[PDB]
Symmetry: C3
Subunit: 217 residues, 3 copies
Amino acid sequence: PCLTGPRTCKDLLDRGHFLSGWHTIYLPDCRPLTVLCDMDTDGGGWTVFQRRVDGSVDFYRDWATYKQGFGSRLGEFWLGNDNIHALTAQGTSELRTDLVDFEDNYQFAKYRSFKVADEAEKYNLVLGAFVEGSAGDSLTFHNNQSFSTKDQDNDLNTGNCAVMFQGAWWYKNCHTSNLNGRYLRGTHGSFANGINWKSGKGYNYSYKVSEMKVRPA
Amino acid sequence: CLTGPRTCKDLLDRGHFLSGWHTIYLPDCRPLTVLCDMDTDGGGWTVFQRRVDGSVDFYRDWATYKQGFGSRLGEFWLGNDNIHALTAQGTSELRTDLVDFEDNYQFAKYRSFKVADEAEKYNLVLGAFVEGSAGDSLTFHNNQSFSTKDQDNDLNTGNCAVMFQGAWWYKNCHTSNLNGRYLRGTHGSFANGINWKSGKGYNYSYKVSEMKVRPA
Amino acid sequence: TGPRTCKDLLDRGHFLSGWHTIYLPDCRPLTVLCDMDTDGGGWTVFQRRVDGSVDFYRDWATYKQGFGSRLGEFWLGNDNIHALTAQGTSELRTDLVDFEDNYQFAKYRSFKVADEAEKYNLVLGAFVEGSAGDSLTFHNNQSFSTKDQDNDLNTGNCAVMFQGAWWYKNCHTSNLNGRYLRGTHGSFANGINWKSGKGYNYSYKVSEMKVRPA
Ligand SMILES: *[C@@H]1O[C@H](CO)[C@@H](O[C@@H]2O[C@H](CO)[C@@H](O[C@@H]3O[C@H](CO)[C@@H](O)[C@H](O)[C@@H]3O)[C@H](O)[C@H]2NC(C)=O)[C@H](O)[C@H]1NC(C)=O
Ligand SMILES: CC(=O)OCC[N+](C)(C)C
Ligand SMILES: CC(=O)OCC[N+](C)(C)C
Ligand SMILES: CC(=O)OCC[N+](C)(C)C
Ligand SMILES: [Ca+2]
Ligand SMILES: [Ca+2]
Ligand SMILES: [Ca+2]
C-alpha cells in the first residue's frame, strides 16, 4: 500500500494529475505526507515546501515549529524541515524559486540541486549551481549554512540574524535572501527584514508571493 | 472507523501539523471532512464557522443552517446537525477567534460547548468563560434555542433573525452576532454586523471570525 | 458504486462547495470542483477565472490535459470536459462578474464537446435564459483553436489576435479564456469578454463555466 502509491509530485503528473493541489505522496520511509503539487510551472511536477501569499500566517517562529512545519493548506505554510530533508536526502532534486511583486511582475531562479541535512546537522544547505532565472542568484551566498530560528542561532554572525532580519533561514552573516521574513507588503523602510531577495527587488521590497519548490533533477 | 481519527486533536497527535480539510470519524463512524486549525492555541481545533471576506450569504433559512453551507475554499457554517454530532459527548471547549481590519486579533475561550439536536432546537449548552481579549459575549446566550428567519424561537415579540440579518441562539436579542452581515468595519446600522458586544461592540463588523472546538 | 457527478455528491449530503473526487463513465477518478450553491447547486466546474494569477494563453497539449490550480484559476482540460459531458445530457451554465460586482449568467439546455479526433468540437443546445445574453450559440459546431493550432475560419489567426483558446469562427462573440485585463480595456476583444454582456472592451473579474445533468 506504500509501493502502490506515488512518491513525488513528478510521479503524480506522470500519472495524469494535471491540476495543482494537495496530494499525498509516500516518503522514502513509507510515511504518507500530504504535499502541494505545482502541476503548472516550468513543465510542472514540483513539490512545494514554502509559500507566502497574503501575510496571513506568522513566520517568525521557533525551532520546534520550523522542524515540524506550520501554516495552512488553504494558504501560507512551511512544510517543515524534517519533511524537506526527507524529500531531498536520497537522490537529486532541482530547486525552483518563484516570486511575484505587487505590480504583477513574475520572477524566478533555478538551482541544479538542493538538499538539506537532518537536524543533527542543523538542516544544513547543500546547493548545486545556479542554472538561470530572472531573479538572479541570491541563494548561493547561503550555501553550506545551517538553518537558524530566533531561539536557535547557528549563523556566522556575532549577533542573531533571525531576530535582526525577523525571519528564519540558512543565514550566514546575514543574508542576501530572506523568504521567511515579515510580510511587509512592497516597499518598506526597515532594513532587510521583509520577504527579500537581494538580487531581485533588493533589501527594501517585500514580495507579494513567494514559493520554494523541488523536482527530481 | 474506530482506529482512524475521531477529532482534529487526533489528527494532530498523529502528526498532521498543517491546518486544512481532513476527514474525521464521528462518535457514530460517519465520515466527515472538517477544517482543522492545527496552529492556534496548541492546535487541534475543529472549525465549525468561518467568516473571512464576505463572499458567502449567511442570512439563510433553517434547512440551510441545519445541513451547513458555504465553501471549503472560504466561508462556511458546518451545519447544526454536524455541530451537534461533534459536541454530543459534551466534553470539548469553544474558542472564538476574531480579526479586525487592522489585523488586531482577539479571542474568547469557553470551557465546554454543546448544542442539542433539532428536536431541542439546537439549544446552546455553554460552560464557563475561562479567559479572553474579546471579553465575554456568549454566556448571555446560554440555554437558548437557535432561530433563523423562518424559525422564530427567541424571546422577542418580533423576529430577531430578521432584525439583525443573522442566525443565532438569539434571546432579546443578542450581545454577539457572528452570523450577521459582513459589513466591513464600522457600520451605522445597529447590531446587524459580525458583532461581539464586549469586543468592538454593536457597530463594528470584524474582518475574520472563527468558532472552533477541541476535546478538553 | 459511487459519485458520478457533483449532483450525486449534493444528493448524498455534501453541501459545501469544493474539490471532490467523482467517477467518470470509464470509471477513471477525477478530482473536480463542485459548486454546491449556485442555482440549486450540484454543478461541476470546468473553468474558472478569479484574479488573473494563471496564464490562459496556452497551447493545444495544455488545453488538452488541463492546467491551473485547485486553489485558484484553471481549465479542467478538454479530454476531461469531453469525458464529462458526452455520456449523458449535461446542462451548461456560465457565471460572469464585473468589477462593480454586477452578476450576470447564461444557461443552455445542453452542452457537449466531442473528442480530440473531432477537434473538441462544441455541440450546444438552446439558450434557456440568461441576463448576460447569448454570446455562445454563435459558436456552435466549431473546432477548438489554440494559438498553436488554428482550426478557425478567419484565415488570419483568431487565437493570436485575441489571445486565448475557444471554438473560434471569424472570430468571436465570447472569449472567456482571454487575457485577464481587469475591467475596461482599450485593446479589442482580447479580454475575458462576453459580447452581449459587457461587450468587447470589458474584461470580467470572475468567470465560471459549469455543468449539471439536465
Ligand atoms: C562548510 O563550512 C565548514 C565550516 O563549518 C567548512 O570547513 C572548513 O573547511 C576548510 C577547507 O575548506 C578546512 O581547512 C582544512 O583543514 C586544515 C586545518 O586543520 C587546513 O590546514 C587544511 O589546509 C584545510 O584547509 C577547515 O578546517 C574547515 N573548518 C571547520 C570548522 O571544520 C567546510 O569546508 C564547508 N563545507 C563546504 C562543502 O564548503
Ligand atoms: C515562536 C513561536 O513559534 O510561537 C509560539 C511560542 N510558544 C510556543 C512558546 C507559546
Ligand atoms: C434564504 C435561504 O437560505 O435560501 C433558500 C431559499 N430557497 C427555497 C430559495 C432555496
Ligand atoms: C440557489 C440554490 O441552490 O437554492 C435555490 C434552489 N433553486 C435555485 C434550485 C430553486
Ligand atoms: Ca551568532
Ligand atoms: Ca419572536
Ligand atoms: Ca485561420
